Symmetry: D2
Subunit: 119 residues, 4 copies
């Protein structure tokens, strides 16, 4: 299971991950299907690390949203079924920008996403 | 303005060191956790992340690839500057463990918080 | 959308929720399909509250696991599609018992579950 | 032994009052949050939960039905007793907002922590 390639998730978002280096580091581009103001969505860079030796590696990455002050992180594992089909099972945290520390409590959304490979 | 560059400790005693933040907001560093399932196996581990650049109190995220387990942690949060200029990173994290197959996926993700302040 | 009735989720767990009172309070019984030691699973009580007036209410409940020292909480919303079909979209936290406060960091798992009505 | 019965404050200044814990571990109470989207609309809200009974440091969960919004929060955690007999509730929470339809479900769930100690 390697992260390199093109992926879609259960919300219809897509991402492309470039080559994974010897340290497990990767870059890519994320197009979310969902946002607070969807008319404002632009492509956003991602940067992460996976484990290299594991056949079904865990990984994490950060998405710097280019159209808001927020940041999302994803972590999960790449699984391979008996037919060679890959799925990324992930959970995420979406951090919004708040004015000061007294508003921190309302700043972090949580959710899930399941990704499959595009063709 | 808040740059993540420098050394930080959190409420559990962990230390991380963040190198220069580039013009995209990308940064690398190391993380020495104070806690693990077997603290005797802990080793210094690499991190990689992105912060926002223009904001004075940026949000950010980073990934820690634990060098002593098959797990990965991601942190996200915001750097706040108080009226005296003191910086605090308020973060939440997800710690992903490796499981043997997808039937075990449900039990693989721990959640928590950490507050960081500067070492020095 | 009312919580009363019999439900299954995407992991194959089932639950039955009894009548919801005027305050939105409900009891029920939860059979998980998954656990650390699945051979030990027994039926476990749940207790929660939903909003009453809303057609698509938010709600929460606690499951006291009768076979371990852990507790799970679920929160989510009941949605009705155009055909009258209900789904509970939930997120959960599973709290394990740890020995003392220094282990608190490793005690809380997070996940999701989608529930649909049994027949 | 740790019973949730009594009054507690958390790190945000919120107060809750938990009534008698029954033989099943069930409890009701009230919660006065210090924080909300519009603090001027906050009202005292009911909670309902379950703790473990046999354990000296029980895990527990409860639901708060906010009486001034369409949201619901759930808390789960553990009551710890330290070597001097002081009790702390360590909790994590999920705050579910009401959204108009399932397409908005992704943005409906906030996560956080709270630490509680006794009022008195």
């Amino acid at each position: 299971c390697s992260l390199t390639g093109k992926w879609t998730n259960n919300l219809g978002s897509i991402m492309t991950i470039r080559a994974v280096n010897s340290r497990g580091e990767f870059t890519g581009t994320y197009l979310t299907a969902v946002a607070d103001n969807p008319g404002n969505i632009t492509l956003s860079p991602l940067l992460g690390i996976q484990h290299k030796r594991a056949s079904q590696p865990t990984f994490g990455f950060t998405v710097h949203w280019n159209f808001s002050e927020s940041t999302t992180v994803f972590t999960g594992q790449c699984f391979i079924d008996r037919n060679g089909k890959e799925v990324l099972k992930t959970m995420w945290l979406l951090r919004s920008s708040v004015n000061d520390i007294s508003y921190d409590w309302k700043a972090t959304l949580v959710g899930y996403n399941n990704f499959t490979r595009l063709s």
